């Protein structure tokens, strides 16, 4: 996805927000710059984009850059972004969380139950060349009380995980109900 950035310096972050320009930063092992996109704009983009999909930043230097969103700090009290970080990628093995499609409705979901998707993305070492829009998961052999860890994954080429081989991806869990109430309040 693409987005038009702007250069910043001494101006008050508070003042920028007044107008509608969300401040932020861009950087890597070599770069580091005070910047600010337009909020309403960034929203449209970041909503779709997220920290999984790359963004092409466009400065008034004609400069295009393949920046990944590192973190976005929010205004506690009525949620809303205050300030962003953009990691300028290059071509080296970078790690980063990437999406997760749990396709197929497990034995539990069928017999009444709940798919608890512990994760919705995975920290994996990877090249800027590789940006698998997702990673499918055959989660269907899941009975009530079962789980799916990292060890089980459809890892595309060149994509090694950075997390643990044990760390769980998701699980099916029992569905709370009203009959449960009788027992709970009693004991």
């Amino acid at each position: 996805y693409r987005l038009k950035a702007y250069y910043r310096e001494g101006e008050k972050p508070s003042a920028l927000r007044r107008a509608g320009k969300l401040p932020g930063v861009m950087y890597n092992r070599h770069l580091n710059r005070k910047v600010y996109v337009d909020l309403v704009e960034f929203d449209k983009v970041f909503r779709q984009a997220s920290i999984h999909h790359v963004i092409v930043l466009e400065l008034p230097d004609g400069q295009s850059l393949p920046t990944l969103v590192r973190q976005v700090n929010l205004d506690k009290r009525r949620r809303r972004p205050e300030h962003v970080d953009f990691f300028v990628l290059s071509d080296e093995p970078v790690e980063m969380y990437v999406p997760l499609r749990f396709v197929g409705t497990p034995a539990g979901v069928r017999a009444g139950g709940v798919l608890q998707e512990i994760h919705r993305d995975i920290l994996v070492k990877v090249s800027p060349r590789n940006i698998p829009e997702f990673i499918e998961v055959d989660v269907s052999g899941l009975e009530i009380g079962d789980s799916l860890h990292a060890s089980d994954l459809k890892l595309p080429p060149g994509v090694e995980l950075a997390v643990s081989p044990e760390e769980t991806i998701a699980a099916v869990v029992p569905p709370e109900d009203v009959e449960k109430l009788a027992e709970e309040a009693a004991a």
């Binding site: 920290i51 929010l74 608890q116 709370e176 109900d177």
Partner: protein, 134 residues
């Protein structure tokens, strides 16, 4: 539970840490206003939620009551309240995420998460999940 004894009141200054983001679940309920939420108040919302979608998905409870609630039996001034009469409470400041629902449709989360809001002493708000993570 265990801890120790009775605990001072302390104020509820700005909702700084008073808050979070949606952890698990499809939707959730946030506090717009600071308050002490009682044990009873909590369970009230819970059981409400379930009762709404019988045999339903999963309700998360991000808040938890650990402050002892002191109170005097209709007397005057010796010692500190035997307290614990309402029992215990949770410090909810503006922003905090209190309940997550998952495994249901919007019209269910909206309704249930709303009904719960009727048990809470506070103005509240129900969130989708935007995308803002970390």
């Amino acid at each position: 539970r265990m801890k120790y004894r009775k605990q001072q009141r302390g104020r509820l200054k700005g909702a700084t840490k008073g808050g979070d983001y949606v952890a698990f679940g499809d939707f959730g309920l946030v506090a717009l206003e600071p308050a002490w939420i009682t044990a009873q108040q909590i369970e009230a919302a819970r059981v409400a939620m379930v009762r709404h979608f019988r045999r339903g998905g999963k309700i998360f409870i991000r808040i938890f009551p650990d402050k002892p609630y002191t109170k005097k039996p209709l007397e005057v001034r010796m010692g500190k309240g035997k307290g614990n009469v309402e029992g215990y409470v949770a410090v909810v400041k503006p922003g905090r995420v209190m309940f997550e629902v998952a495994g249901v449709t919007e019209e269910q989360a909206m309704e249930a998460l709303r009904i719960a809001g009727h048990k809470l002493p506070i103005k509240t708000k129900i969130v989708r999940r935007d995308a803002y993570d970390e």
